[PDB]
């Protein structure tokens, strides 16, 4: 289907159906629309490094893609990868202009190592996103701290 | 209702020389938006369906030889055949598809001009089988001649009791053939012993009988 | 590869009815607007009817309006025309015709880029009559037959060169007559399902 | 629109991105799922009532205005055309003070 | 929406860009004002009537459709989603010929 | 708006991209047509009823809000402002359940 | 004028006028709006290489421009240019990040050669576009297969 | 607040309030919306070089940002900086792809020099923009002529 | 760290009223939906009431509807239940309970992940009566006391091993009796504020 | 109103061996959207509030030891304890939170099977203090025995004038304890000099008195 | 470069009418709001009227309302004021004035940055009268003339130093008198088109 | 209707010393949005139109010398001239353009204080030409004197039959000049042979005649 859009009334949350339109839903300004990025650790995912690395993997034939998210959650655990292959060459791409590290991290797990980079880019096995500064990417960037999460789109109440 | 008018109705040109056919519409078939003149040309050989030659007045259909070319716009249009050759003998129609109802021209018959040729005349008396039917039909054949133009029982001329049929121009030697059928009841047939066929033609210095 | 095979037609009495069929090969009728075009004996062409792909936009010639009903079957890749209350003036050769792809019922038309073999339709009060084959001695005289057409060949398609088959002529009796000559003739009259071979 | 092109292919064998059935399991995940040349879906549209030949001409006539629009903008890659067309569509109808009985207003009292 | 995740953090300590009071003097000037890591404002939303745990699940279910949307587009960075959602929101209500009494039309005569 | 700038040039000699007459022949083709410095058209607007001096001040007051908007976004080049303003314009009028007689609704029964 | 927008009802096609608005026209979702890229070969253009190269030419003082098109047609003939100048230097720019080859080609005419690149970028003489993967550019990119066509914008019927 | 939007009726100018909507305001096409860039020199600012350089300064920790403006004013005085530091290295970034020089300048003050570039990027002290070709940036680019001004957004009258 | 401290309860006559209190520590009530659950003597668990964070969505058990009114104070991090027109069947131990964070009044519920210490509620027409402590010679016989509960310890929490305190039994007189043995006993009856130490 | 049914009501298993408890709901508690079975398991030890064990039928709460595991979906569910041990002696409740009102099962009591143990019997005559109250209560203690099952004034049997109380299974040695209270007015007490307690048990070869 | 040339004015009877003109040079009237300002003899300044660029927003002083009508011609770069039903109190010097570019009829005004040369307007029932030039022997006595003004120079603009031309004084006869001295005088009275040169 | 009030009305200051002029508005001319005080200052020299000096109370117009400076806000404002010099002799007006109708102050006349200077007195009897008009006007000139302040036929004082005119302060030497005109009918003129002009001034130790 199309991208689900959550609608908030008071403290209740509903999912806007395309076929059924609710006139009670009011949108007076684009400033009511808000895109939120929520971390995976909030779902009870293991934050330890070996469990995390197992959630990531390399692949080729898949271009990298990026979205913008306007607001995010403070992360207890973030990650920063700097890894190569036996020949000493980097297997992770440099963060292109505009992509910075996740703005809020308590503990940042700096990771180094070497291995068989079996792909051009490193994606998320579970389909989640690597959240950066107001940008969620499908790929890990070199040397830039990140937190892994997912994005939701909202239409806030009458403010 | 647009009325398309072609001219000439008939045309005879020597092999290798050029032939032009005109077309005139009651109204302009020029589309303002496209600046394209919505008119088409077709070729129809004897016993065959039409074949598309030109569309949008000037554009050759795929497969049409280069010697065919159309031109014009609005009201007056022309189809031109440079170097006629033999395979181009046909009836050529023009058509407008600017507005409904789609209408065709009267058509133009294109024939080849040939050196004069004298008809080889033959006479065929009625057979035994036909005589059993109580009728008698005398036939006279004029074989391979040019041009198409050309025109007696006991030395007495008949009238209204016979009619003729002409073949199409030969695709190879460009010679016409003509069949004349004289039909009379078998009763009148036996009354006369002599039947003479007189043929007059421009391709002959004097009438052959 | 690309062509149109036609069926139906033949003899029919005034007021009678007939259904012409046309089957396409080498393309899909959905892409093109189909038409019917007639040609009277020895006369020019006259547009009869047209039908769009969706069968939404249909048109007839004023002379035909109300008597003919055109139809098509895109799945079967076929075109049909049902004709009713036929009269003498409808006596003609009916061609199944494909119009260019640029044609639409709501806009400008296109050219007739493909034409069918054609089918003879004869409206007459006279009944079918086989031919009488008389020898000419050379050639064969095919006399008193109806309706058209009749095909002639020599020795089952062997002798061709020097052969001249004359056009048929309508006699005073309302029956056709024809002569074929060359410098055994296979006669075939489909309307009467008659086949004759005269030596 | 009326096709003025010399030839016109009535058959439109097309490709696109937008899919129908999202439930192929986990194939939606970028790590899995199609490579760059497998993301597409194909189809076949026929020239129904000269629709295709119409589109073909439309694409031709749009080129002029489109090329100029690109000259005006300074951004390298423009993706905002369709959303812009959606906004212009609304503004056209509701720009706007809407008179029910009058034209340039799509309202009916029933 | 019903959270199906094994655990759910009810407390949402969040950060964002949009501010409240623009008058901090000249701090709006880029030469002055916050560095890259100071542009943010923080807040705390509580799980009121399972709102947060609802959002958390919503973010999970949206992932599939979102990931596919990105596959379709060819632009590297997509910022046009929210504006697109705003347009779809209007088109849904005014697409559109609006019948007052009937549904799919938000009008009241009073 | 009231100009508070020390001096104000009333004459506005301006340049822009959007043209009037598209039919210059084939000049719309990128291969032909103007070079980078010829794509523009010029004009002259006069300070009618302090319009220009008004615009000048407006551009000054807009700077604060604009600069902050840019701080919030993370995209390098922002072209989506005007389309966003078009959407906000519609949402303002049709956000929205529309009461004819009441305010915040632009409808008239005639 | 502005960019023409084609409107489809049933199988009929109309061109939305700005002055005359048709209330019959309905647009319920941005998913109805579709931008299509159609190949030139469908118009009867010669697909042979020498006729094609004659349709392309070099020029300077004209920045390159790109649009997005959502759907395209299968091409019988595509082209891939890799050309230089006598001094061995490339006269065609490398395909920037994000631009890939046309997704569907039966025959791909790989072209190599040398000549007087009289301009920085190579445009289309007839004003058409070089269609790539969901992107139409005004310029030929180095080594990346492309098909030459034009773009149309549509508002589809009620789906 | 949000970005102010000026509304023009006849020759009068008003500022659209968000709380108070004026139904007299009509917007029939996005082509009515116009973003204008106005030069500072029109406000009586000193155009001399030393006064101008004093309005610019270097800073770090602030990413560069850019907006698009559709129309601009002819400038009497523009500026083009090419400056380094004692070690001969450039302290100004090269103009990224797409950014060209201001389209209209009477006098262009070409500036060269050396000094203590105390920051990665050079911003405007008064908060104004450096206007380039249909793009206003918060930073000075190397070697590319520019004019300093500010941007306003408008909704023009019924045309 | 995380816990719930309960107050209130005790003896009350039929028709009387009581107010149970519950104070949270280690979390914020705003995040979770709170519940009350009761447990009759020697019988299973019965859900009583629930209240959402916003105090918007409230529910009672049909057996309780109209008689009890639940309430909460998020700022004070407290939960309260006011009970009115009490009867014998309401005699039970009332637990203050936290439901999972996934629970919402407008959707699916969640589990009871944290339970309070519980508080005894006794509905009886009989008045409070202190215990009579008789020695057993070893152990202590606590006889004729009401209402429950009574706690027993030996030498002020010294002797523990080998100690067996039997459950109380309701005598024919409507008063409770209990015996405590081990192979000075500190007796405490809160309902009567009686403390006895028998050697 | 869903009715949850647990089985067995009581269960006694040897230490280290496995124990299973069933749960049956009146209706399916399977949520179609989640494919999650909304059912929970609690543990309640004597004198303590319940403790959460399992949620969503199969998922262990944090801190619950591995030996606890739930399973099932829809209607039938089961709680399983592998290797019972001592600390697992409690009452186990199942609960549905699929739809309101939330309902609990009848509960299952889990006890430990132990080697038979003979009760150490003691008798306690009434004290002086109680005699001042004009009443007499004789008490007989059966200390540390297994199983729970087991059952005379002047050699005359009494009836209806006494009642007994049983402790919970010991958390360590898994032995029960039993208290029998015989209550009679002090008037009847003095009428008799002899009070004999007879104890019959399966853990004894013959009755002890 | 930038300036304003004024015309019109002079003598007029009470109730009479006059039309002041003002022509701009060095700028365009479209850019600025134009005003008229008067100055009575020996008294301060009084704002009369104003007119915006679009000629949409117009204003008059309450003392003038209904009697004067201001107008402008942007194409001709000119400003005009038509005055009707003139009276004594309107007797003054009328200045054509440019207001700052920030002024708008619908908002705050701006300053008068450019002023015209001014033009004398005299409302009196008395008719024009040329001067009588008497010698002073040095200087010239210009007596009994009306209306103002009169200009004096010596030897056609040669002698300037040491020259003192006194302000005119209104005599009891309602006619003006003036004396000019220095330590031939060119007398010019425009209102009567009189030019005198006394040695 | 705002009423602007200037003070002092007249002012005389020595060259090179400073002079201040006040301005008071009936109402505040402070614009809340701009924090700009909408008030302007003009300079008007004799026989010339006003010249803009200050706008927005404190901002010098282009070309105005530095010695001119305005200040204040709301109600009270001041114009200050440091080092007066000669070219600054004029009438100075203040104006509010906060709200319509725009209003001016009463104006302040700025003059230069000079060392005292004694008037050079001259007498001029009536000419022949005037006598032909049947009238006689006697004139007495007081040339180049300071200050402006200062004030007989057959030794008989006249009254009401004469009036005087004073020039403006000289732009160079800062000296005033005064003209006294005595007008009488020629009839009364011939009645007397002697006409004496008495001048009294502070710049003289005793009256000159």
List chain D residues with CB under 8 Å of A123: 29-31
Q: Which residue has the tokens 């040109």?
A: B13
Give chain B's count of helices (H) and strands (E).
2, 17
E-state strands within chain K: 3-7, 10-12, 18-25, 34-39, 45-51, 58-60, 68-73, 78-83, 92-99, 112-115, 119-123, 132-136, 139-145, 151-154, 163-165, 169-170, 176-182, 185-189, 194-198
Question: One fold for both C1-125 and C126-199?
Answer: yes
Report the alpha-carbon distance of residue K13 to residue K86 in Å, rounded. 8
Cβ within 8 Å of residue H27, ≥6 positions away: D91, D95, D96, F86, F89, H33, H155
How do the domains of chain D map onto residue ranges?
1-110
* I98 interfaces chain E, CB cutoff of 8 Å: no
Cβ-count burial C8-34 (b if 16+ within 10 Å, e if not): bbebbeeeeebebbbbbeebebbbbbb
- SS3 string, L112-159, reads EECCCECCEEEEECCCHHHHCCCEEEEEEEEEEEECCCCCCECCECCC
* Element (DSSP H or E) covering residue I39: strand I34-39
Cβ-count burial C74-111 (b if 16+ within 10 Å, e if not): beebbbbbebeebeeebbbbbbbbbbbbbbbbebbbbb
Cβ within 8 Å of residue A29, ≥6 positions away: F88, F91, F92, F95, H18
Report the alpha-carbon distance of residue B10 to residue B22 in Å, rounded. 11
Report the alpha-carbon distance of residue I159 to residue I181 in Å, rounded. 11
**In the structure encoding, which two tokens stand for residue J110, read together?**
């889990």
Contact D57, D5 (CB under 8 A): yes
E-state strands within B47-175: 51-55, 59-60, 68-73, 76-81, 90-96, 103-104, 108-113, 120-124, 135-145, 162-166
Q: Which residue has the tokens 């942007």?
A: K74
Nearest CA in chain I to A11: I54
Q: Is B38 in a helix, a strand, or coil?
A: coil
The pairing of beta strand D107-108 with beta strand E98-99:
parallel
**Which of F75, F91, F96 is nearest residue A30 as measured by Cβ atoms?**
F91
Dmax over CA atoms of chain A, in Å, equals 62
The CATH code of domain L114-209 reads 2.60.40.10
Chain A residues whose C-beta is within 8 A of a chain H C-beta are 29, 31, 98, 100
Task: List C-alpha distances in Å: C100 to B95, C5, C34, G44.
Answer: 14, 18, 9, 14
Report the alpha-carbon distance of residue B47 to residue C152 in Å, rounded. 14
At residue A44's C-alpha, the angle toward residues A38 and A47, to 5°, is: 85
Could you say which architecture CATH assigns to the domain I1-125? Sandwich (2.60)
Bridge partners for G149 per DSSP: G39, G129
The pairing of beta strand H66-68 with beta strand F77-78:
parallel
In 3D space, the residue among H44, H47, H113 whose CA is nearest the CA of residue H82 turns out to be H113
Interface test with chain F among H28, H43, H61, by most F beta carbons within 10 Å: H43
Report the alpha-carbon distance of residue B78 to residue B73 in Å, rounded. 9
Contact J110, J58 (CB under 8 A): no
**In the structure encoding, which two tokens stand for residue A141, read together?**
């960037």
Q: What are phi and psi of G10, to 5 degrees?
A: 55, -110
Rounded (10°) CA dihedral D11, D16, D18, D23: 90
D56, HSE (Cβ side, Cα atoms, 13 Å): 28
Q: Which residue has the tokens 């079996």?
A: A118
Q: Taking the CB of residue B103, how many other CB atoms lie within 10 A of it?
A: 22
In 3D space, the residue among K183, K159, K136 whose CA is nearest the CA of residue L144 turns out to be K183
Q: Is L95 in a helix, a strand, or coil?
A: strand
Question: One fold for both B1-113 and B114-209?
Answer: yes
Cβ within 8 Å of residue F25, ≥6 positions away: none
Contact E14, H46 (CB under 8 A): no
Fold of C126-199: Immunoglobulin-like (2.60.40)
Contact G143, G114 (CB under 8 A): no
The secondary structure of G41-56 as a DSSP string is GGGT---SHHHHHTTE
* Element (DSSP H or E) covering residue J129: helix J128-131
Q: What are phi and psi of A113, to 5 degrees?
A: 165, 180
Cβ within 8 Å of residue L190, ≥6 positions away: none
How do the domains of chain K map onto residue ranges?
1-125, 126-199
Report the alpha-carbon distance of residue G123 to residue G137 in Å, rounded. 9
Rounded (10°) CA dihedral J24, J28, J33, J39: -20
The alpha carbon of K178 is separated from its chain's Cα centroid by a whole number of angstroms, namely 19
Report the alpha-carbon distance of residue E44 to residue I31 in Å, rounded. 12
Say yes or no for a CB contact (<8 Å) between E79 and F80. Answer: yes
Handedness of CA E36, E40, E42, E45 (dihedral sign): negative
The secondary structure of J4-58 as a DSSP string is -EEE-SEEEEETTS-EEEEEE-SS--EETTTTEE-EEEEEE-TTS--EEEEETTT
Q: Is L186 in a helix, a strand, or coil?
A: helix
* H57 interfaces chain D, CB cutoff of 8 Å: no
Regarding chains C and F, contact by 3 or more CB pairs under 8 A is answered as no
**In the structure encoding, which two tokens stand for residue L38, read together?**
């909408």
Cβ within 8 Å of residue B106, ≥6 positions away: B4, B5, B6, B9, C44
Q: Is C190 in a helix, a strand, or coil?
A: helix
Report the alpha-carbon distance of residue J15 to residue C60 in Å, rounded. 98
Report the alpha-carbon distance of residue E44 to residue A42 in Å, rounded. 15
The pairing of beta strand L10-14 with beta strand L108-113:
parallel
Peptide bond into A38 cis (omega under 30): no
Peptide bond into E93 cis (omega under 30): no
* K106 interfaces chain H, CB cutoff of 8 Å: yes
The alpha carbon of F2 is separated from its chain's Cα centroid by a whole number of angstroms, namely 19
Task: List C-alpha distances in Å: F101 to E10, F98, F107, F108.
Answer: 45, 9, 8, 8
How do the domains of chain B map onto residue ranges?
1-113, 114-209
Bridge partners for H4 per DSSP: none
Say yes or no for a CB contact (<8 Å) between B167 and C112. Answer: no
**In the structure encoding, which two tokens stand for residue F78, read together?**
């922002």
Regarding chains D and C, contact by 3 or more CB pairs under 8 A is answered as yes
* D84 interfaces chain F, CB cutoff of 8 Å: yes
Would you give the DSSP letter of residue D86? H
Task: List C-alpha distances in Å: L29 to F4, K106, L23, L77.
Answer: 15, 18, 12, 10
Handedness of CA I48, I50, I56, I57 (dihedral sign): negative
Contact G32, G16 (CB under 8 A): no
At residue E61's C-alpha, the angle toward residues E59 and E65, to 5°, is: 105
Q: Which residues in chain F (53-72) have CB-CB distances under 8 A to chain D?
A: none
Cβ within 8 Å of residue E22, ≥6 positions away: E28, F64, F65, F68, H1
Q: Based on the number of CB atoms within 10 Å of its own CB, is F88 exposed (0-12), middle (13-18) or buried (19 or more)?
A: buried
**Which of C30, C102, C107 is nearest residue D48 as measured by Cβ atoms?**
C30
Report the alpha-carbon distance of residue I118 to residue I43 in Å, rounded. 15
Contact F64, E25 (CB under 8 A): no
**In the structure encoding, which two tokens stand for residue D60, read together?**
């031709």
The secondary structure of C39-53 as a DSSP string is E-TTS-EEEEEEE-T
Q: Taking the CB of residue A69, how many other CB atoms lie within 10 A of it?
A: 27
Nearest CA in chain F to A99: F74
Would you give the DSSP letter of residue B134? T
Would you give the DSSP letter of residue E50? G
**Which of J38, J42, J107 is nearest residue I108 as measured by Cβ atoms?**
J38
How do the domains of chain A map onto residue ranges?
1-159
- SS3 string, chain H, reads CCCCCEEEECCEEEECCCCCCCCCCCCCCHHHEEEEEEEHHHHCCCCCHHHHHCCEEEECCCCCCEEECCEEECEEEEEEEEEECCCCCECCCECCCCCCCCCCEEEEEEEEEECCCCCCEEEECCCCEEEECCEEECCCCECCCEEEEEEEEEECCCC
Task: List C-alpha distances in Å: B186 to B190, B196, C177, K10, L159.
Answer: 7, 17, 18, 134, 168
The pairing of beta strand K176-182 with beta strand K163-165:
antiparallel
Peptide bond into L155 cis (omega under 30): no
Radius of gyration of chain F (CA): 20
Peptide bond into K154 cis (omega under 30): no
Q: Based on the number of CB atoms within 10 Å of its own CB, is D81 exposed (0-12), middle (13-18) or buried (19 or more)?
A: buried
Report the alpha-carbon distance of residue B169 to residue B109 in Å, rounded. 11
List chain B residues with CB under 8 Å of D6: 59
Contact A105, A147 (CB under 8 A): yes
Report the alpha-carbon distance of residue L104 to residue L95 in Å, rounded. 4
Would you give the DSSP letter of residue B153? B
Contact K42, K58 (CB under 8 A): no
Fold of L1-113: Immunoglobulin-like (2.60.40)
Interface test with chain G among E68, E73, E74, by most G beta carbons within 10 Å: E74
Q: What are phi and psi of L19, to 5 degrees?
A: -130, 135
* K55 interfaces chain H, CB cutoff of 8 Å: no
Contact D11, E53 (CB under 8 A): no
Contact B141, C183 (CB under 8 A): no
In 3D space, the residue among J100, J57, J50, J167 whose CA is nearest the CA of residue I38 turns out to be J50
């Amino acid at each position: 289907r199309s991208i689900p859009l959550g609608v908030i009334h008071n403290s209740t949350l509903q999912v806007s159906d395309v076929d059924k339109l609710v006139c009670r839903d009011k949108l007076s300004s684009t400033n009511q629309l808000r895109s939120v990025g929520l971390n995976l650790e909030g779902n009870g995912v293991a934050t330890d490094v070996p469990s995390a690395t197992k959630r990531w993997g390399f692949r080729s034939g898949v271009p990298p893609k990026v979205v913008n998210y306007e607001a995010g959650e403070w992360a207890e655990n973030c990650y920063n990868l700097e890894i190569k292959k036996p020949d000493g060459s980097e297997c992770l791409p440099a963060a292109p202009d505009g992509i910075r590290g996740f703005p809020r991290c308590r503990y940042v797990h700096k990771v180094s190592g070497t291995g068989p980079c079996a792909g051009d880019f490193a994606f998320h096995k579970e389909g989640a996103f690597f959240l950066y500064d107001r940008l969620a990417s499908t790929v890990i960037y070199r040397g830039t701290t990140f937190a892994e999460g997912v994005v939701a789109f909202l239409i806030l109440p009458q403010a | 209702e647009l009325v398309m008018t072609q001219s000439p109705d008939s045309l005879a040109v020597s092999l290798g020389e050029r032939a032009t056919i005109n077309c005139k519409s009651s109204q302009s078939v020029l589309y303002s938006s496209n600046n394209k003149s919505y008119l088409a040309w077709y070729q129809q050989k004897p016993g065959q369906p039409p074949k598309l030659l030109i569309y949008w007045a000037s554009t050759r259909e795929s497969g049409v030889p280069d010697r065919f070319s159309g031109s014009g716009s609005g009201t007056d249009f022309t189809l031109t055949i440079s170097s006629l050759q033999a395979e181009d003998v046909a009836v050529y129609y023009c058509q407008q598809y600017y507005s409904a109802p789609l209408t065709f021209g009267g058509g133009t018959k294109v024939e080849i001009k040939r050196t004069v040729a004298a008809p080889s005349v033959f006479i065929f008396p009625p057979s035994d089988e036909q005589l059993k039917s109580g009728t008698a039909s005398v036939v006279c054949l004029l074989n391979n001649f040019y041009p198409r133009e050309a025109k007696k029982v006991d030395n007495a001329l008949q009238s209204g009791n016979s009619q003729e049929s002409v073949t199409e121009q030969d695709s190879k030697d460009s010679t016409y053939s003509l069949s004349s059928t004289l039909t009379l009841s078998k009763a009148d047939y036996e009354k006369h012993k002599v039947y003479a066929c007189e043929v007059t033609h421009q391709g002959l210095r004097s009438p052959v009988t | 590869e690309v062509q149109l095979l036609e069926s139906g037609g033949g003899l029919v009495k005034p007021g009678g009815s007939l259904r012409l069929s046309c089957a396409a090969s080498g393309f899909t009728l959905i892409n093109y607007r189909m038409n019917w075009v007639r040609q009277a004996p020895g006369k020019g062409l006259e547009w009869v009817s047209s039908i769009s792909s969706s069968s939404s936009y249909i048109h007839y010639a004023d002379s035909v309006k109300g008597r003919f009903t055109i139809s098509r079957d895109n799945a079967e890749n076929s075109l049909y025309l049902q004709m009713n209350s036929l009269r003498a003036e409808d006596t003609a050769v009916y061609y199944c015709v494909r119009e260019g792809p640029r044609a639409t019922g709501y806009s400008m038309a296109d050219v007739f880029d493909i034409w069918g073999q054609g089918t003879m339709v004869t409206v007459s009060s006279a009944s079918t009559k086989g031919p009488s084959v008389f020898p000419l001695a050379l050639g064969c005289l095919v006399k008193d037959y109806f309706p058209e057409p009749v095909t002639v060949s020599w020795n089952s398609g062997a002798l061709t060169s020097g052969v001249h088959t004359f056009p048929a002529v309508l006699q005073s009796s309302g029956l056709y007559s024809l002569s074929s000559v060359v410098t055994i003739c296979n006669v075939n009259h489909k309307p009467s399902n008659t086949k004759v071979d005269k030596k | 629109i009326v096709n003025a092109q010399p030839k016109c292919n009535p058959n439109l064998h097309y490709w696109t991105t937008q899919d129908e059935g999202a439930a192929i399991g986990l194939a939606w995940i970028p790590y899995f799922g199609p490579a760059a040349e497998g993301i597409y879906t194909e189809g076949l549209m026929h020239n129904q009532d000269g629709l295709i030949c119409g589109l073909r001409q439309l694409a031709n006539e749009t080129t002029q205005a489109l090329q100029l629009f690109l000259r005006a903008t300074t951004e390298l890659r423009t993706f905002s055309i369709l959303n812009r067309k959606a906004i212009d569509f609304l503004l056209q109808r509701w720009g706007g003070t809407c008179h029910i009985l009058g034209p340039d207003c799509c309202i009916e009292p029933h």
